[PDB]
Design a protein around this ligand. Structure first.
Ligand SMILES: NC(=O)c1ccc[n+]([C@@H]2O[C@H](COP(=O)([O-])OP(=O)(O)OC[C@H]3O[C@@H](n4cnc5c(N)ncnc54)[C@H](O)[C@@H]3O)[C@@H](O)[C@H]2O)c1
Ligand SMILES: NC(=O)c1ccc[n+]([C@@H]2O[C@H](COP(=O)([O-])OP(=O)(O)OC[C@H]3O[C@@H](n4cnc5c(N)ncnc54)[C@H](O)[C@@H]3O)[C@@H](O)[C@H]2O)c1
Lengths: 427, 427
C-alpha cells in the first residue's frame, strides 16, 4: 500500500437509500497527468476556503490521495497505471474527484478514464454547461447557453472492442462477418481494422430514464434525444426509439413527445400536431424531442436557447460537450460527474493539456465547478453556492486565466495561482 | 424507362484521360425530396443565367433529369427509391448534381445518399466552408473561417453494417465475439444492437493522399488529420498513423509533419521541435498536423483561423461540416462534392428540411455553390466566378433567405424565388 487513510476523517456510507455524509468526510482525490498538477491543488484550495467560510470549521473535507497514471507508475512500478487499491478505495469511499489522465493515440493502454467509468458502472456522464457572466467567448450571445448533458457512459464504441488492420484477429472477425453474417459492405476487407459498436435497450433506457427524471425534478422545459439514427439505425436509432417508448410508458401523461406529435399529425394534419404541442407547453408538460446529431451541432450554435436537457450516446456526448463548452469559453469552463446509482467520480471535461503542462497556466474552473457538483452531491449546498457566487464575481470582474484571455484583445491573463487567489479573496 | 437523353446535348468525354466538355454538355440532375423542389430549380436558373451571360449563348447546359427518392417511387413504382437506370446514367455522363434525399430513422431504407457514394466509389466528400462577407452569423468573427473538409466517403460506420437488439443475428455475432474473440466489454450482451466500423489502410490512404494533393496545389498552409484515435485506436488512430506515414513517404521535401516534429522533440527537446516547425513554415512546407475529434470541435470555434484543410473519417466529417457551416450562417451556405477519380456528384451539405418544405423558404445557396464547384470541375471557370461574384454582392447587400435573416435582427427574409431573382440581377 501507498495510500493513507486520513486521521480525522470518516467515510461516507449508504443506509437504507440515503448517502450518509459525516462533517469530516473522507474524499479521495487523484491529481491527474499534465495540468492535473495545477488544477487539483487549486481546486482543493478553493473548496477548503469555501467550506471554512460557510460552516466556520464545523465541517472539513478530509482529502485522501489515490494514484493513477504517471504518478501511479512512478510510485507502484511499470504498468501500474491503475492500482487495484485505487479502485477498491473509490468503491469503499463512494465519491472521488480526479484530474485528467493521459490516453495514448493509436496504441498503448486503454483509457483509464473510461476504465474507471466501466469498472464502477458509472453509466451517467453528467455535464452542465452554462455561461458565467463576462466570460470571453467566440459567440455573439453565449448567455443563451444553459444546458445539461446526460451522456451514456457504459457502452457505445467506447467499449474499446477493436482489432488492428492485418492482424490475425481482424482477419478472423472479417471472415466471420463475410462468411457467416453475410456482410457485403466492407469496402477494403484486406486492410480493414474493425471496431464494434454495442448499444442496448437496457443501457439506453437507464440513461434516458435518469435524464427525464432530472428534467422533471428541476422544472426543465425539454429533453432532446440526439442520435445519428438514420445511418446507425439499430444502435443510435434504437436509442431514440427506446427513449420515446420509455418516456411514454414510464411518464405517461407527464411528458409530450415528438413521437406523439407525429402520430397526431399523421392522422389529423400538421396544425393539429402543432396545437397539441402548444397545449402541452402551456400545461407545464416536459417536452421530449429528438435531433439528428449533425444538425444538432448546427442548432446548438444557431439557437442554443431552444435546448435545455440533452440525452445522448457516449461518442455523441463527448463531441457535444466540447462544442458546447467552446461557446462559453472552452473546456476550461466545463465541469462533469460520472455517476452510477451509488457512486460518483467528479472530473472536468478537459484533458491533460500537454501544450500548457508545467507552465502554471491552466484554468482550474472546470475542476472547481466539478467540486461544486461534488459538494451538491454531499448535501453541502451552501459551500457549493459560495463557490459559484465567487466564480460569477471573479469572471465578471475580468479576472481570468489565459485560455479565456486569448479570446479577447481587451482581457489580460492571470496564472492558475493568480486566478485561484482572485477567487478565494472574494469569499 | 422514365428518363430521356436531351435532344441538343452531347456527353462529356475524355482525351488522354482528361475531361472533355462540349459547349452543350449533358448534365444529369436529381431534384431531391422536400426542399429539393425549391433549391434545384433555383440552382438551374442561376447556373443557366450565368452561363448565358459569360459565354454569350455559345454554351448551354443540357439538363437531364434522373430520379431518386419519393419522385422515383411515384414514377417507377413502390420500393423504387433508386432505379438502376439512375446510377447507370450517372456512370455514363460522369457528372451530376442532386438535391437532398430522405433517409428514415430507426429503420426503413438505407440512405440513398450513401448508396450513390458507395456504388460509384465517390470516396472523397469535399466540402469547402468559407464566410461570405455580410452573412448573419452566431459568431463574433466568422470571417476567420476558411477551410476545406476532405471527408472519407466510402467506409467507417457508414457502411451500414448492423443488426437490431434481440435479433437472431445480433445474438449470433455477440456469441461469436464473446466465445471466439474473447470480448468481455459488452455491458449488456442480452439486449445490445451491434454496429460494425471498418476503417482501412487503403481507404484512409487514398482520401488523405487526395487531401494533401489539394492542399499543395492550392497553396494551403496545413492539413489537419482529425480522429478519435485515443479511444478508437486501430480505426481512427490507424487513420492518423497511416496518414502521417503516407505524407512522409509520398510528399517528402514538401511537407513537415507533427510525427517528424515529435521525433525532433524527443531527441533534442521541444525547443528544437518548435524551431524545426518554424523553419518548415518559413521554407514554404505544408504542415501536417492532427487533432483529437472532440478538441477539434472546440478549436474550430475558439480559433478556426489556425486551420485550413482537414482530412477526416466519414462520421467525423459529417459532424464537422455542420458545426463549421453554422459559423458562417448554417447549412444553407455549405456546398459539397462527392468525387471518385473519374466521376462526380455535386450536392449540398443539407437535408430535406421538413420544417420548411413546401413553403418556398429554403436557402438555395448551398446547392448553387455546389454547382459553382461543378462548373469549375467542367473547366467553365468564368461562369463559376460570375456566380460567386453575384453571391458575394447579394449577401453583402443584405438580400438573404429566412435561415440567415433569423440570425440577426432588422434583416428581412426573402423567399427562395426572391433570392434567386436577386442573385440573377447581378449578372
Ligand atoms: N477525462 C480526462 O482525463 C480526459 C479528457 C479529455 C482528454 N484527455 C486526454 O488528454 C490528452 C490530451 O488530449 P487533447 O490535447 O486532445 O485535449 P486537452 O483537453 O488535454 O487539451 C485540448 C486543448 O484545450 C486546452 N485546455 C484543456 N484544458 C484546459 C484548461 N483547464 N485550461 C486551459 N486550457 C485548457 C489545452 O491547452 C489544449 O490546447 C489525451 O491523452 C486525452 O486522452 C483526458
Ligand atoms: N445529402 C443529403 O441528401 C442529406 C443531408 C443531410 C440530411 N439528409 C436527410 O434529410 C432529412 C432531414 O434531416 P434533418 O432534419 O436532421 O436535417 P436537415 O438538413 O434537412 O434540416 C436541419 C435544419 O436545417 C435547416 N435547413 C437545412 N437546409 C436548409 C436550407 N437550404 N435553407 C434553410 N434552412 C435549411 C432546416 O430548416 C432544419 O431546421 C433526413 O432524412 C436526413 O437523412 C440528407
Amino acid at each position: 500500500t501507498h495510500i493513507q487513510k486520513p486521521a480525522t476523517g470518516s467515510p461516507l456510507t449508504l443506509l437504507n437509500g440515503v448517502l450518509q455524509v459525516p462533517d469530516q468526510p473522507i474524499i479521495p482525490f487523484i491529481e491527474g497527468d499534465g495540468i492535473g498538477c495545477d488544477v487539483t491543488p487549486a481546486m482543493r484550495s478553493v473548496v477548503d476556503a469555501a467550506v471554512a467560510k460557510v460552516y466556520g470549521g464545523q465541517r472539513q473535507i478530509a482529502w485522501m490521495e489515490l494514484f493513477a497514471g504517471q504518478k501511479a507508475v512512478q510510485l507502484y512500478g511499470e504498468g501500474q497505471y491503475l492500482p487495484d487499491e485505487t479502485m477498491a478505495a473509490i468503491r469503499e469511499y463512494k465519491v472521488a474527484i480526479k484530474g485528467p489522465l493521459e490516453t495514448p493515440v493509436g496504441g498503448g493502454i486503454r483509457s483509464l478514464n473510461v476504465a474507471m467509468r466501466q469498472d464502477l458502472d458509472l453509466y451517467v456522464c453528467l455535464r452542465p454547461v452554462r455561461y458565467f457572466e463576462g466570460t470571453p467567448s467566440p459567440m455573439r450571445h453565449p448567455e443563451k447557453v444553459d444546458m445539461v448533458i446526460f451522456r451514456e457512459n457504459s457502452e457505445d464504441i467506447y467499449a474499446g472492442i477493436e482489432w488492428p488492420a492485418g492482424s490475425p484477429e481482424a482477419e478472423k472477425i472479417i471472415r466471420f462477418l463475410r462468411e457467416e453474417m453475410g456482410v457485403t459492405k466492407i469496402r477494403f476487407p484486406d486492410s480493414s481494422a474493425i471496431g464494434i459498436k454495442p448499444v442496448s435497450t437496457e443501457g439506453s433506457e437507464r440513461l434516458i430514464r435518469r435524464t427525464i427524471q432530472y428534467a422533471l425534478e428541476h422544472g426543465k422545459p425539454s429533453v432532446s434525444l440526439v442520435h445519428k439514427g438514420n445511418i446507425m439505425k439499430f444502435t443510435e436509432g434504437g436509442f431514440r426509439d427506446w427513449g420515446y417508448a420509455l418516456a411514454e410508458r414510464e411518464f405517461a401523461g407527464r411528458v409530450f413527445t415528438w413521437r406523439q406529435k407525429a402520430a397526431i399529425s399523421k392522422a389529423e394534419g400538421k396544425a393539429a400536431g402543432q396545437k397539441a404541442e402548444q397545449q402541452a407547453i402551456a400545461d407545464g408538460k416536459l417536452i421530449i424531442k429528438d435531433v439528428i446529431a449533425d444538425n444538432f451541432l448546427q442548432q446548438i450554435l444557431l439557437r442554443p436557447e431552444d435546448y435545455s436537457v440533452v440525452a445522448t450516446l457516449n461518442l455523441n456526448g463527448d463531441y457535444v460537450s466540447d462544442a458546447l463548452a467552446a461557446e462559453v469559453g472552452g473546456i476550461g469552463m466545463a465541469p462533469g460527474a460520472n455517476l452510477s446509482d451509488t457512486h460518483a467520480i467528479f472530473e472536468a471535461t478537459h484533458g491533460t493539456a500537454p501544450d500548457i503542462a508545467g507552465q502554471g497556466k491552466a484554468n482550474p474552473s472546470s475542476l472547481i465547478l466539478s467540486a461544486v457538483m461534488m459538494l451538491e452531491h454531499l448535501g453541502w449546498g451552501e459551500a457549493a453556492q459560495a463557490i459559484v457566487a465567487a466564480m460569477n464575481a471573479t469572471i465578471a470582474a475580468g479576472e481570468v486565466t489565459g485560455d479565456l484571455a486569448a479570446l479577447r484583445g481587451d482581457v489580460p491573463a492571470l496564472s492558475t495561482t493568480e486566478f485561484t487567489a482572485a477567487l478565494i479573496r472574494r469569499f
